[PDB]
Write a protein that holds these residues in place. Structure first.
Motif, PDB file in Angstrom:
ATOM      1  N   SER A  95      40.310   4.243 -16.544  1.00  0.00           N
ATOM      2  CA  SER A  95      40.811   4.980 -15.405  1.00  0.00           C
ATOM      3  C   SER A  95      40.659   6.460 -15.685  1.00  0.00           C
ATOM      4  N   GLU A 135      37.050   7.745 -15.543  1.00  0.00           N
ATOM      5  CA  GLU A 135      36.693   7.857 -14.111  1.00  0.00           C
ATOM      6  C   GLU A 135      37.259   9.079 -13.428  1.00  0.00           C
ATOM      7  N   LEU A 136      38.537   9.436 -13.682  1.00  0.00           N
ATOM      8  CA  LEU A 136      39.115  10.715 -13.171  1.00  0.00           C
ATOM      9  C   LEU A 136      38.271  11.875 -13.611  1.00  0.00           C
ATOM     10  N   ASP A 171      35.028  11.967 -11.800  1.00  0.00           N
ATOM     11  CA  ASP A 171      35.133  12.275 -10.422  1.00  0.00           C
ATOM     12  C   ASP A 171      35.341  13.794 -10.291  1.00  0.00           C
ATOM     13  N   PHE A 172      36.167  14.329 -11.177  1.00  0.00           N
ATOM     14  CA  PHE A 172      36.631  15.716 -11.044  1.00  0.00           C
ATOM     15  C   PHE A 172      35.409  16.609 -11.360  1.00  0.00           C
ATOM     16  N   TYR A 197      32.823  16.453  -8.483  1.00  0.00           N
ATOM     17  CA  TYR A 197      33.314  17.155  -7.367  1.00  0.00           C
ATOM     18  C   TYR A 197      33.073  18.627  -7.583  1.00  0.00           C
ATOM     19  N   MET A 233      43.751   4.790  -7.504  1.00  0.00           N
ATOM     20  CA  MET A 233      42.818   5.802  -8.006  1.00  0.00           C
ATOM     21  C   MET A 233      42.414   6.866  -6.962  1.00  0.00           C
ATOM     22  N   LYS A 247      42.509  10.965  -7.606  1.00  0.00           N
ATOM     23  CA  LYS A 247      41.270  11.772  -7.530  1.00  0.00           C
ATOM     24  C   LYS A 247      41.392  12.897  -6.517  1.00  0.00           C
ATOM     25  N   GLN A 248      41.918  12.564  -5.320  1.00  0.00           N
ATOM     26  CA  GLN A 248      42.029  13.535  -4.246  1.00  0.00           C
ATOM     27  C   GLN A 248      43.041  14.587  -4.606  1.00  0.00           C
ATOM     28  N   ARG A 253      41.479  16.802  -7.329  1.00  0.00           N
ATOM     29  CA  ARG A 253      40.474  17.699  -6.761  1.00  0.00           C
ATOM     30  C   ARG A 253      41.160  18.898  -6.105  1.00  0.00           C
TER      31      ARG A 253
END
Length: 144
Positions: free
Chosen positions: A5, A8-9, A12-13, A16, A31, A35-36, A39
């Protein structure tokens, strides 16, 4: 895994941030709410604090010769007073910044290394506090 997990954060970060700033994320390929929130927390921290992390980047002076131990010693300075949510957001923004700097130094190979260093550090040093303080759900409660 919580470890999975966390990696993946990180991806993603960083994706982005690279996308946002005009760069490629092609080294990379509840998740969603985490993530949102992360961000958005990175954007808010960067607009407001406008940190160049000048001291940290200069101490690191990252090259493809740099080892994780050197990244760990520098990033440890964000946590000299221990972990909290704002320093965790600062760690994510710092690693986005190192990604962008690496691209700007024509050292694009480092981007995927920095994501690996960030996941290792987050899983080793930061998760204990995160879990003790309600996990990422609490992060969403405060930010999201």
């Amino acid at each position: 895994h919580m470890s999975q997990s966390n990696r993946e954060l990180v991806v993603d970060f960083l994706s982005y941030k690279l996308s946002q700033k005009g760069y490629s994320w092609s080294q990379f390929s509840p998740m969603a709410a985490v993530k949102q929130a992360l961000r958005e927390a990175g954007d808010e921290f960067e607009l407001r604090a406008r940190r160049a992390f000048s001291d940290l980047t200069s101490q690191l002076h990252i090259t493809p010769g740099t080892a994780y131990q050197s990244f760990e010693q520098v990033v440890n300075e964000l946590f000299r007073d221990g972990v909290n949510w704002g320093r965790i957001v600062a760690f994510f923004s710092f690693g986005g910044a190192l990604c962008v700097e690496s691209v700007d130094k024509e050292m694009q190979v480092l981007v995927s290394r920095i994501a690996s260093w960030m996941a290792t550090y987050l899983n080793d040093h930061l998760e204990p506090w995160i879990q003790e303080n309600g996990g990422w759900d609490t992060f969403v409660d405060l930010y999201g």
